[PDB]
Motif scaffolding. Structure first.
Motif, short mmCIF file in Angstrom:
data_model
loop_
_atom_site.label_atom_id
_atom_site.label_comp_id
_atom_site.label_asym_id
_atom_site.label_seq_id
_atom_site.Cartn_x
_atom_site.Cartn_y
_atom_site.Cartn_z
N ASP A 1 1.11 -1.51 -0.10
CA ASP A 1 0.29 -0.34 0.12
C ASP A 1 0.65 0.90 0.20
O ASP A 1 2.05 1.40 -0.04
CB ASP A 1 -0.97 -0.11 1.00
CG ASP A 1 -1.51 -1.53 0.85
OD1 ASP A 1 -2.59 -1.50 0.60
OD2 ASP A 1 -0.74 -2.15 2.04
N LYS A 2 0.22 2.17 0.25
CA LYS A 2 0.82 3.59 0.45
C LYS A 2 1.99 4.26 -1.52
O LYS A 2 2.66 4.63 -1.14
CB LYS A 2 1.77 3.42 1.61
CG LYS A 2 1.29 3.17 2.38
CD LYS A 2 0.28 3.90 3.70
CE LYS A 2 -0.52 3.14 3.73
NZ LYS A 2 -0.64 1.50 4.67
N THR A 3 1.19 3.20 -1.99
CA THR A 3 1.65 3.86 -3.06
C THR A 3 2.17 4.69 -3.67
O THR A 3 3.34 5.70 -4.32
CB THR A 3 0.58 2.16 -4.38
OG1 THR A 3 0.61 1.07 -3.82
CG2 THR A 3 1.80 2.83 -5.56
N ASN A 4 0.83 5.41 -3.79
CA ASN A 4 0.95 7.11 -4.59
C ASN A 4 1.54 7.48 -3.61
O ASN A 4 2.13 8.90 -3.73
CB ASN A 4 -0.85 7.26 -4.04
CG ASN A 4 -1.66 7.46 -5.62
OD1 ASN A 4 -2.26 8.47 -5.75
ND2 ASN A 4 -0.74 6.83 -6.78
N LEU A 5 2.05 7.15 -2.27
CA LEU A 5 2.91 7.86 -1.51
C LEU A 5 4.46 7.79 -1.92
O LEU A 5 5.29 8.60 -2.26
CB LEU A 5 2.97 7.46 0.06
CG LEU A 5 2.01 8.14 0.81
CD1 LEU A 5 1.89 9.69 0.29
CD2 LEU A 5 0.61 8.99 0.00
N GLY A 6 4.74 6.20 -1.63
CA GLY A 6 5.91 6.00 -1.78
C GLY A 6 6.91 6.44 -3.06
O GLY A 6 7.99 6.01 -3.73
N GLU A 7 5.44 6.41 -3.99
CA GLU A 7 5.85 6.47 -5.38
C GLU A 7 5.80 8.04 -5.94
O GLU A 7 7.00 8.66 -6.46
CB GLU A 7 4.48 6.06 -6.64
CG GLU A 7 3.53 6.98 -6.67
CD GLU A 7 3.87 7.40 -7.88
OE1 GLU A 7 3.92 8.29 -8.16
OE2 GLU A 7 2.45 7.28 -8.29
N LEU B 1 0.90 15.52 -3.69
CA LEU B 1 2.77 14.89 -4.29
C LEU B 1 2.55 14.89 -5.47
O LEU B 1 4.00 15.15 -6.33
CB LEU B 1 2.52 13.19 -3.61
CG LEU B 1 3.76 13.24 -2.27
CD1 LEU B 1 3.43 11.31 -2.05
CD2 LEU B 1 5.01 13.28 -3.04
N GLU B 2 1.38 15.09 -6.12
CA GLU B 2 1.79 15.24 -7.87
C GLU B 2 1.32 16.24 -8.00
O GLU B 2 1.58 16.74 -9.58
CB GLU B 2 0.44 14.18 -8.11
CG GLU B 2 -1.26 15.06 -7.84
CD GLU B 2 -2.60 14.04 -8.62
OE1 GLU B 2 -2.02 13.31 -8.66
OE2 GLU B 2 -3.59 14.61 -8.68
N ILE C 1 5.42 18.49 -6.11
CA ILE C 1 7.05 18.11 -7.12
C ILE C 1 6.85 18.20 -8.10
O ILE C 1 8.13 18.84 -8.68
CB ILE C 1 7.05 16.25 -7.21
CG1 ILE C 1 5.59 15.93 -7.66
CG2 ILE C 1 6.64 15.56 -5.89
CD1 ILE C 1 5.63 14.51 -7.75
N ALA C 2 5.79 18.00 -9.24
CA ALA C 2 5.26 19.11 -10.48
C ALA C 2 5.99 20.62 -10.20
O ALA C 2 6.41 21.31 -11.47
CB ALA C 2 4.00 18.86 -10.49
N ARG C 3 6.17 21.61 -9.17
CA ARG C 3 6.13 22.72 -8.75
C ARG C 3 7.98 22.89 -8.77
O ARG C 3 8.37 23.55 -9.58
CB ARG C 3 5.43 23.15 -7.77
CG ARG C 3 4.22 24.29 -8.37
CD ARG C 3 3.03 23.62 -9.24
NE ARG C 3 2.30 24.69 -9.06
CZ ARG C 3 0.91 25.04 -8.58
NH1 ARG C 3 1.68 23.76 -6.70
NH2 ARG C 3 0.28 25.28 -8.96
#
Length: 140
Positions: free
Chosen positions: A2-8, A65-66, A69-71
């Motif tokens: 789990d926590k893919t969206n995070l760890g990724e 997070l999405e 970082i993009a910023r």
């Protein structure tokens, strides 16, 4: 796992801010970057390793997070932010493009930082690129 969206989205996050540095040119941003990309982390990591980081916290922590970082990615004087006009010209964009709005969160297309405000962060590069552009006579 789990926590893919995070760890990724965080793996790179804390690795970005810890790779980047606030300076005043390509490879280093001006200021205010180390926070955003981390703010998403402070808020993400807390979720990445969170227990309720299920269907409620992940998406809730991936949001910035999405988008954080993009910023920051374009905060270190984007490896190619020199193109302020967007057409390919680095000489007047400092005294006509960027300095024009200065502090506008609408024309981020030419902010070395992309902080949503043409400020010093966006003048750092050109200010230098302009001077140290050539040593023969003129023109790029």
């Amino acid at each position: 796992m789990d926590k893919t969206n995070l760890g990724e989205l965080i793996n790179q996050g804390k690795s970005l801010l810890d790779e980047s540095v606030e300076g005043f040119n390509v490879g280093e941003y001006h200021k205010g970057a180390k926070d955003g990309l981390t703010v998403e982390i402070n808020k993400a990591e807390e979720v990445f390793n969170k227990e309720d980081a299920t269907e409620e916290e992940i998406n809730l922590a991936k949001e910035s997070l999405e988008g954080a970082i993009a910023r920051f990615n374009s905060l270190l004087i984007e490896e190619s932010t020199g193109d302020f006009n967007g057409n390919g010209k680095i000489d007047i964009g400092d005294l006509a493009m960027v300095s024009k709005n200065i502090g506008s969160t609408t024309n981020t297309s030419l902010d070395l930082n992309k902080d949503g405000s043409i400020d010093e962060y966006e003048i750092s590069f050109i200010n230098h690129r302009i001077l140290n552009l050539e040593h023969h006579h003129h023109h790029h």
